[PDB]
Write a protein that holds these residues in place. Structure first.
Motif, PDB file in Angstrom:
ATOM      1  N   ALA A  43       0.806  -1.213   0.000  1.00  0.00           N
ATOM      2  CA  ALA A  43       0.000   0.000   0.000  1.00  0.00           C
ATOM      3  C   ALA A  43       0.850   1.280   0.000  1.00  0.00           C
ATOM      4  N   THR A  44       2.150   1.142  -0.244  1.00  0.00           N
ATOM      5  CA  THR A  44       3.100   2.253  -0.227  1.00  0.00           C
ATOM      6  C   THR A  44       3.313   2.784  -1.649  1.00  0.00           C
ATOM      7  N   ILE A  45       3.086   4.073  -1.853  1.00  0.00           N
ATOM      8  CA  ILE A  45       3.369   4.690  -3.155  1.00  0.00           C
ATOM      9  C   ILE A  45       4.741   5.385  -3.058  1.00  0.00           C
ATOM     10  N   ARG A  46       5.618   5.195  -4.061  1.00  0.00           N
ATOM     11  CA  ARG A  46       6.965   5.814  -4.076  1.00  0.00           C
ATOM     12  C   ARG A  46       7.038   6.943  -5.078  1.00  0.00           C
ATOM     13  N   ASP A  47       8.166   7.666  -5.063  1.00  0.00           N
ATOM     14  CA  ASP A  47       8.419   8.772  -6.018  1.00  0.00           C
ATOM     15  C   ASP A  47       9.790   8.571  -6.655  1.00  0.00           C
ATOM     16  N   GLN A  48       9.813   8.381  -7.976  1.00  0.00           N
ATOM     17  CA  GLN A  48      11.081   8.225  -8.698  1.00  0.00           C
ATOM     18  C   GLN A  48      11.865   9.533  -8.857  1.00  0.00           C
ATOM     19  N   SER A  80      15.977  -1.199  -1.980  1.00  0.00           N
ATOM     20  CA  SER A  80      16.570   0.084  -2.460  1.00  0.00           C
ATOM     21  C   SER A  80      16.423   0.270  -3.959  1.00  0.00           C
ATOM     22  N   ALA A  81      15.606   1.234  -4.381  1.00  0.00           N
ATOM     23  CA  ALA A  81      15.578   1.658  -5.791  1.00  0.00           C
ATOM     24  C   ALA A  81      16.963   2.098  -6.293  1.00  0.00           C
ATOM     25  N   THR A 114      18.434  -3.104   1.198  1.00  0.00           N
ATOM     26  CA  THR A 114      17.287  -2.287   1.645  1.00  0.00           C
ATOM     27  C   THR A 114      17.562  -0.793   1.448  1.00  0.00           C
ATOM     28  N   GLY A 115      16.515   0.021   1.449  1.00  0.00           N
ATOM     29  CA  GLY A 115      16.686   1.467   1.336  1.00  0.00           C
ATOM     30  C   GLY A 115      15.342   2.172   1.194  1.00  0.00           C
ATOM     31  N   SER A 116      15.105   3.149   2.063  1.00  0.00           N
ATOM     32  CA  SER A 116      13.824   3.891   2.074  1.00  0.00           C
ATOM     33  C   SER A 116      13.822   5.049   1.093  1.00  0.00           C
ATOM     34  N   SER A 117      12.737   5.830   1.145  1.00  0.00           N
ATOM     35  CA  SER A 117      12.670   7.128   0.488  1.00  0.00           C
ATOM     36  C   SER A 117      13.731   8.070   1.084  1.00  0.00           C
ATOM     37  N   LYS A 118      14.038   9.170   0.380  1.00  0.00           N
ATOM     38  CA  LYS A 118      15.029  10.143   0.868  1.00  0.00           C
ATOM     39  C   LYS A 118      14.591  10.658   2.214  1.00  0.00           C
ATOM     40  N   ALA A 122      16.285   5.748   5.770  1.00  0.00           N
ATOM     41  CA  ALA A 122      16.389   4.466   6.458  1.00  0.00           C
ATOM     42  C   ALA A 122      16.948   3.342   5.574  1.00  0.00           C
ATOM     43  N   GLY A 123      17.464   2.280   6.191  1.00  0.00           N
ATOM     44  CA  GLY A 123      17.987   1.125   5.421  1.00  0.00           C
ATOM     45  C   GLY A 123      19.392   1.364   4.857  1.00  0.00           C
ATOM     46  N   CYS A 124      19.894   0.425   4.081  1.00  0.00           N
ATOM     47  CA  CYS A 124      21.262   0.517   3.604  1.00  0.00           C
ATOM     48  C   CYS A 124      21.492   1.704   2.670  1.00  0.00           C
ATOM     49  N   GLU A 125      20.636   1.843   1.649  1.00  0.00           N
ATOM     50  CA  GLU A 125      20.826   2.870   0.597  1.00  0.00           C
ATOM     51  C   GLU A 125      19.503   3.580   0.244  1.00  0.00           C
ATOM     52  N   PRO A 126      19.075   4.540   1.103  1.00  0.00           N
ATOM     53  CA  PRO A 126      17.861   5.316   0.833  1.00  0.00           C
ATOM     54  C   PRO A 126      17.985   6.104  -0.465  1.00  0.00           C
ATOM     55  N   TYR A 127      16.853   6.506  -1.040  1.00  0.00           N
ATOM     56  CA  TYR A 127      16.875   7.137  -2.361  1.00  0.00           C
ATOM     57  C   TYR A 127      17.485   8.516  -2.189  1.00  0.00           C
TER      58      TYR A 127
END
Ligand code: NA
Length: 277
Positions: A43-48, A80-81, A114-118, A122-127
């Motif tokens: 249910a999570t929407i991301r932003d590229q 991570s994106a 792993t990696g969250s939004s900017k 959070a996580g190894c490599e956030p955006y």
């Protein structure tokens, strides 16, 4: 943005599944968010952001879903994106567009950290790139027409994250195409979770605010990669339910619907997924 994989490569790099032996009742509507409510990624929407990384977004989003679904909620991660975008060499050109199929191959072979939004850091490599408005107005600054350069592939986590980059990798066990066939796509999503897919972008898509999208006016702008999470019907018209990667201010709170069953904008032509076990 997203471009289609050469068909000789698509045919040879991974199997295609059809679920023809599976004689299950297909419900008239399905929403992955409802079937697996404890998997918060669905249910999570991301932003590229200002980057043509839709191919990587549809991928790490469906992969994060499937990691939770196929482990019975034991793995709850946000992949991570940026790791996929920057490190997959056979996937295309980073922020300048990429190819779906090889991203799932990459997840199987090398895995993704792993990696969250900017904003969540959070996580190894956030955006590394901020939220921005894509073809609409809202709470974020407009994206505009500038594109970030693809970040280099760093193979290290942010300072505060303790698990080393290599040990933070989450791998699939298998990748595959889904047959261009409505029932095969439905069967796949209801059994194994959301899939990635690609479609042709026409000018009128950039004006979409609500409803069941179908191309009516305007020229082609290229390709886009997204995450199909379910399907349904409104006033007898069938649709797919899809997560876009242009944040929650775009479309139907980040989502959209598009005609289903007629390969509208080739939506049923480049479906790709994979499994963790
Ligand atoms: Na993100």
């Amino acid at each position: 943005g997203a471009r289609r994989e050469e068909p000789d490569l698509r045919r040879t790099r991974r199997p295609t599944v059809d679920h023809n032996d599976w004689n299950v009742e297909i419900p008239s509507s399905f929403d992955s968010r409802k079937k697996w409510p404890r998997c918060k990624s669905i249910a999570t929407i991301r932003d590229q952001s200002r980057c043509g990384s839709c191919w990587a977004f549809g991928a790490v989003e469906a992969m994060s879903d499937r990691s939770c679904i196929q482990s019975g909620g034991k793995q709850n991660v946000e992949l991570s994106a940026v790791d996929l975008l920057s490190c997959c060499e056979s996937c295309g050109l980073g922020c300048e567009g990429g190819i779906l199929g090889p991203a799932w191959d990459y997840w199987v072979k090398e895995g993704i950290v792993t990696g969250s939004s900017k904003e969540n850091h959070a996580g190894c490599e956030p955006y590394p790139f901020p939220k921005c408005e894509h073809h609409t107005k809202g709470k974020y600054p407009p994206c505009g027409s500038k594109i970030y350069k693809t970040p280099r592939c760093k193979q290290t986590c942010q300072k505060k994250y303790k698990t080393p980059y290599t040990q933070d990798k989450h791998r699939g066990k298998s990748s595959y195409n889904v047959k261009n066939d409505e029932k095969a796509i439905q069967k796949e999503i209801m059994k194994y979770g959301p899939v990635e897919a690609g479609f042709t972008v026409y000018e009128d898509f950039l004006n979409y605010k609500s409803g069941i999208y179908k191309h009516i006016t305007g020229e082609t702008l290229g390709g886009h990669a997204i995450r199909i999470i379910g399907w349904g019907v409104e006033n007898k018209a069938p649709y797919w339910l899809i997560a876009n990667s242009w944040n929650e201010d775009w479309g139907e709170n980040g989502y959209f619907r598009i005609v289903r069953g007629r390969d509208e904008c080739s939506i049923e032509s480049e479906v790709t997924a994979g499994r963790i076990n």
